[PDB]
């Protein structure tokens, strides 16, 4: 995407980090359910603005990372595909707007940015500026000018929905004794038994008054089984 015109991808229910042929990777992790994603081609200098807690025209007027997001970003030099003679003026971005962006805000209206009192009436002039810019990135580009391709990921960390990454597994099951457990949205250790009751199914799990987990809709049938902490006590 042209970053001012960024494009979502929404993905669930399936890592290339099992290689590192790609060059660049900003991250907060190293499996989980499902994700929102975006991607862009960017000149190597401007990537500075692409972090939580960042400045400048990108954070102003093209994109906004939430300063409290969670997610990861991978980038690599895309000169090889992209940094071609003369052209590449397709790859647009917004230089001005009436206001700064909120997280994942977007704007592709292209009215002339008036500035000050000027009733610029849709025509460019002094103090009457057209809102956008584009790289026109080319083979002579120094690396700060050269395009990197970049992909952006952020995590739908709610755990009742069923989804997963590509690389994951699961075992058989048993009804008793202490065991070490996992689910794509739940993991730990516990001494399981049956349940006296069943949930509203929208709830993935029952929880104690202490907020510890109590039961979960086990995907073997979304089934409901009720668990003591594994038998422990003073001596």
């Amino acid at each position: 995407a042209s970053v001012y015109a960024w494009n979502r991808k929404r993905i669930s229910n399936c890592v290339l980090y099992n290689s590192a042929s790609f060059s660049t990777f900003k991250c907060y992790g190293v499996c989980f359910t499902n994700v929102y994603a975006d991607s862009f081609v960017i000149r190597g200098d401007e990537v500075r603005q692409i972090a939580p807690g960042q400045t400048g025209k990108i954070a102003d007027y093209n994109y906004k990372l939430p300063d409290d997001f969670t997610g990861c970003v991978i980038a690599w030099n895309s000169n090889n595909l992209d940094s071609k003679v003369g052209g590449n003026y397709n790859y647009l971005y917004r230089l001005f707007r009436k206001s700064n962006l909120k997280p994942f805000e977007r704007d592709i209206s292209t009215e002339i940015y008036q500035a000050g009192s000027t009733p610029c009436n849709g025509v460019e002039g002094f103090n009457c500026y057209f809102p956008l810019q584009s790289y026109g990135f080319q083979p002579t580009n120094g690396v700060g000018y050269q395009p990197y391709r970049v992909v952006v990921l952020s995590f739908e960390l709610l755990h009742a929905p069923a989804t997963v990454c590509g690389p994951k597994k699961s075992t058989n099951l048993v009804k008793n004794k202490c065991v070490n457990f996992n689910f794509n949205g739940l993991t730990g250790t516990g001494v399981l038994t049956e349940s006296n009751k069943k949930f509203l199914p929208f709830q993935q799990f029952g929880r104690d008054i202490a907020d510890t987990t109590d039961a979960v809709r086990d995907p073997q049938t979304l089934e409901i089984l009720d668990i003591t902490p594994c038998s422990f006590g003073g001596v």
Partner: antibody
Amino acid sequence: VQLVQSGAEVKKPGASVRVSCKASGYTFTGYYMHWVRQAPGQGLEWMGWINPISDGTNYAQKFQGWVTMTRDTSISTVYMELSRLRSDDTAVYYCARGGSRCSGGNCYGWAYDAFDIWGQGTMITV
Amino acid sequence: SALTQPASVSGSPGQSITISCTGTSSDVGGYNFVSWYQQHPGKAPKLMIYDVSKRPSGVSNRFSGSKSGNTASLTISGLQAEDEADCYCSSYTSSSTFVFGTGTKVTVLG
């Protein structure tokens, strides 16, 4: 720096005529581009501009309703059509690329970087 | 446009004949954006001033652009026989328009 345009697209009077101009070396899109005309011993007109990085324009309202600018990014090219003219509309007509603002780069890479090559809207005979 | 300036303003070298490119407080005095040009006829022209007096890069030699109010007021900063030539003027104008002058022939004296 490069700039070129079409020459004497001659007619017989009353009619429409097309033009193309071309500029490069300069990052052709970098700012809005202007049309200009003069004739021998006459003054020089400006008639409007096109923005490469949009479709936006200005005109001199003398000319709107019978002049017809347009621009390209597939081949870094720009174009004009002068249409159904008055009899003996005849001169030489041109392209140029100045204006109000830096738009980065050479922060005043401006008008006479491109105030350039010529062509002759005309009628003639063998 | 009716914006105007004389013809064949002339002199012997070094005498620095001066060009009252003149218009209106809606154009020349309207705007901080006035512009000036010269040439040997038939060539593409030669700009010397783009705003009041600020010369482009390379434009320095024997140039003295200026404005006050509704007059752009360029001094050619002394003639130097430089001129099988003619001289011209322009500005940016209201509604982001642009304007041009009559221009002015030059001649050189002994």
